Each structure stands twice: as structure tokens, then as C-alpha cells.
Amino acid sequence: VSKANVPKIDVSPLFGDDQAAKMRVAQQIDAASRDTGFFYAVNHGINVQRLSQKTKEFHMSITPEEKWDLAIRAYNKEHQDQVRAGYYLSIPGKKAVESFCYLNPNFTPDHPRIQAKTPTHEVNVWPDETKHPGFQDFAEQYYWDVFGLSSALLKGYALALGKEENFFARHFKPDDTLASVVLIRYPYLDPYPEAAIKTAADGTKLSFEWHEDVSLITVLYQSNVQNLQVETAAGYQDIEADDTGYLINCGSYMAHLTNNYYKAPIHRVKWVNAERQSLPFFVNLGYDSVIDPFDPREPNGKSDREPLSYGDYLQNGLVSLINKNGQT
Template sequence: MAGPVKELAAPAAVKTTALNCISLSDPDINKSVSLLKQACLDSGFFYVVDHGISQEFMDEVFFQSKKFFDLPLPEKMKLLRNEKHRGYTPPLDELLDPENQVHGDYKEGYYIGVEVPKDDPQAEKPFFGPNQWPSKDILPGWRRVMEQYHQEALRVSRSIAKIIALALDLDADFFDKPEMLGDPIATLRLLHYERGKASNPVKGIYGCGAHSDYGLITLLATDDVVGLQICKDKDARPQIWEYVAPLKGGFIVNLGDMLERWSNGVFRSTLHRVIVDGQERYSMAYFVEPSHECLVECLPSCTSETNPPKYPPVTCAAYLSQRYKDTHLDLTSYHENQTREEKT
């Protein structure tokens, strides 16, 4: 799918932005709230350290991610994402910025959600159901590592959500309710940018097109290869992009669109993209959204007579389903290609 490329000239030298760093082990919660609030008002991005996940385990998760992406493409395609968004996404599967991209993203990924057995009534919901797992014969121990990381990342997310709640003048446990992070749609996505596939914004080629995330917050762990860029003011012309430096042992955390809706635009969901220079790059994004039935509507602490709600209420499931549909290839296109190949 091609579209007009707005970025017609090579951008000026891109600087690296400075982000606030929040320690989850700091006993001074007011300090953490202040740092987070400033970050949310400024850029919507911040670092989180001292989160309790060991570096050894983080290294193991990256190692296991690489083992999957090193598999031959036919093996990976056996685990092609399903209608529940579980499994493998090939390069060009996702198109996040059709106004600037001539093709989809030059990245491959793997979705892992909350594990829900097929016979569980919850499995009828979008984004819930069994995960797809590589064969134990091919990748022994892979599922165990990914499930443990999924649980650890959710624990960290809940800790961050407490600080966000306090920054919004809410009770610390606001996001712990069953309809929110008590029964979340939490999705781990492993990502791989292939060596030799350099981005070229002038030609509309991106590792990952410009977008804002859909949910509450995203925890991003990366290797040491620079690539993530953010645009603090999406309405500026021209847009100014800044790199975010990787932070070994820490997470890069950003706010999603649902939090922007909840906060009535006080906290912003920031545009970001990935520009790679041809180096191989690995990252792991953990997307945290509330439950399917959660109604995302303006918080009382974020509205007034002079600042009425900017967004209509919407359920989490409806909002997410539409966003995924808008940005991913229709699965029937893969099945049609397979049928054509079988006939030739």
C-alpha cells in the first residue's frame, strides 16, 4: 500500500533527547510522582530503573527472542498471527504511517498475550485465547522464558500505574481495579529489525512508521542499537524528531492513547518511530491495556467547566480492535498468497 511521502527533504541532524529517570525502589514516592508528571507533560516518555527484573534474565529473554527470529521463514510462518493477534508478524505486515510510508514496517515481530485456554469463556473475547508457541523440539524452554517475562513485565507495569494514578490526583490503586489492570489485555511483542535494511525517510522507508501506542502504557526494552525517535509536538511543521538512547537494564516507558483520553489530553501519547541504519536491532515492547469492558472516559480530575471532555467514552476492546484492524494486513491476504503458491 503506497501513499504520498510528506518527508521530502533529508532531516537535519537528529539530536538525542534527555528523559527523566524513575527508580521504582526510591522510597520518596513524591519525587517519583514529580518526575513522572514532568515527563508526561513534556514528552510522554521516561526511563524506569530498579524494577526488580535481573539483567541475567533480561539477557536470556533477548537470547531466546533471537533464537526464534533466526529460524527459517517457513518455520516462522507456521506460527503466523491469528485473528486474536497471537504469533508471528512478517516484515511489511504492519503499516503505521500510510501518509509517509510506501511499504509497511521493515520489522518482524511475535505477539504473546495473556494465556487463556481455548475452552475458557474468556477466550471468546478479542485479544484473549491460547498463545501460539514454537515447538518444544525446536525451541526448548522458549515458552517458559516468555511467560515468566510476561508476568514480570505486568508486575512492573502495575507499579508504574500507581505512580501515574498519583500524578493524576487519583488513589494509588486506581488502575488496580478488576475492570482495569486486574484483568488486563497485556501483550508482549518481540521485535527484530533485519541487518542491511536501512531506513530512508526521504523514500518513505521506515523500520517502524510514526505512530502513538494504543493503550495505557508501553514498556520497551532494547538492545544497544539506537533507532527509536520521538516527536514531542506532532502538530509542529516541520516535525522535529529526537533519538531516545537505549538504557541497559532499564525500560523506556511511554504513554498510550487511552491514557491521553483518560487525562483529557493533559498527559500526551507521543508520536514515535524507528529509524535504523542497517544494523540488526532487537527490542521487546510490552503493551498494557485495561480489561475489555473498561470504559475509557475523561477522569473527573482532568475536566472542568473551561476544559470539557475532548474525547467520547469508548470501551477498551472496541478501541483496540479498530486500531489493530487499521494498521495490520488482512489475514486473508496471506491465505490467498498461499493458495496461489500451491497452484503454481
């Protein structure tokens, strides 16, 4: 029943050249990462009003025909090459959530990872421009807008851990990042399908069960409806909503790299009967990216943990999350 301490951090110095100001932001990122694991990034410079409005226009105007045409393999056997990118359909009376996922716009048929058929790389699919004017242009621009914000946040995390500010960001590149945007619609439904509600061990009704994120960090915009909870030793705590800020947390690749110094917080989504948006950007590195693990608690930083290539981590992590928490 209690509320999580989720600080609001002004991240604007991370876009600048005042090095001491950057360190003061890094200290706040460190403090939040060692407490509940969540913070809100404010003063981030992204037009989140336009994001929410264009996402709503898309979700509310797409038709069943278009959803089949864009559907991932789980919903359309014809689309064997769409495991990640495309439309994730709701199932009326059974499954409420629906979403649209897209990847690096630089993944084209020309791209070498696409020509090589490397797992987790796909070419995006888009709706018809004449039915959804300007949607693809908006979505591709948004990808690079939130890429820029994430690059800045990664400098803060690096400084927080005592590393040079490009320690993570040097692996986060426009030509090969596996980062994804997911545009999730959580609808208002009356009656709400009981099959779409899960009951937690503690009795709480949920839309999505406990999990750690498959990411380096997760950069999340949500509309102003409270839904997230974070697990602490004393139980789950509510995360207050803020539809002007981005909610940030670490994923399990950060926990691995840091020998669990920055844990990947376990969190879950409460069931709320309300029309709302959940728009995550999953900060993923490149397929071949490897960061040597270190232990910030040790003077010498020595860690015995194996370096893990990001591509293998991502492939395994996405499948495991489907197996554990269900096809979304």
C-alpha cells in the first residue's frame, strides 16, 4: 500500500559541457539506482504531447485488416520473418493489450546484418501512408529523439559508476543498435475480460506479472494513470505516474555488468480499467557488443563474471520473457 521514492532528476546538464553539473546528475542517478531503481528524467527536451497524440491517432484508427497485414508471426503464420517488429493483436474477450513494435530505421534490406540474416535484426513494417499520413515519419523521428535522450542518460550512468562518460554510449550506435520502441495500448473495457486479469500471490490484480527488464536501461513514457509497482524487501510499492517525465530503470544487462551493484528492479503492472498508453524504449546495444563486467564495490573493480555478447543476451532474454509472462 506504500509508495516508492522515485526522484525527479533534471537531466538537462547531460546535454551540456558543465562537467561538475554532470557529476551532480550522476550522483542522483547513482542514489536512485541503489534505492528503488527508478527515477523520472525531467527537462528532457522531447515533445511528449505530440508523441501521445500521434500514438493515440494510430491506435484508434487502425482496422482489423491492417492489424493482420502488420501482425507478428505469433498472430500470422505468413509472417515468419516478423518475430519482433509489427503489430501485437488484442484478442477480444480474452486479451486486452495490443501494441506496435518497431526497430532501428537503419535496418533496411541493404543492411549487412539483414543480408546476413542475423537473429534479432528485422526490417520494420509500416501501415499504408494514405491511411495513416505522417505516422511513419513521426515514429522514425521519435526513435532518434529518444535515442538522443538515452545516449545522454548513458553518460550519466557511466559517470555514476566512476567510468568515462562514453563507457556505455560508445556501444550505442545508430548503425547497429537493437533498441526498440513499443507503442502499447491498454484499453478501457466494459466488461473487462477476466482472462486478461492475473491475480498475484499477494492478491493484487495485475495486467502484467513481475519481471526484470531485458535491456541495458529502459526509457518509458506513460500517460497519467498509476499502474506500476516495484518490489522491495518490504513488499511492492506504487510508482506514481508523471505524464511529463520519462521513467528510467536498469535492465538485467546492467545488473550483470555491474555484478548486481545496480540491480534490475523487479516490477509489475497493476490492472486498472482505464484507457492509457505505455511507450517504452528499450536501450539495447549492438549484436556483437561486449562490455567487460566490473565490480564497483572492489578497489580494483575485479569481477569473475563472464563477458556476455549483447546479441546472445537479447535473443535468450526475449524468449524467456515470453515463456514466463506470456505472449504480449
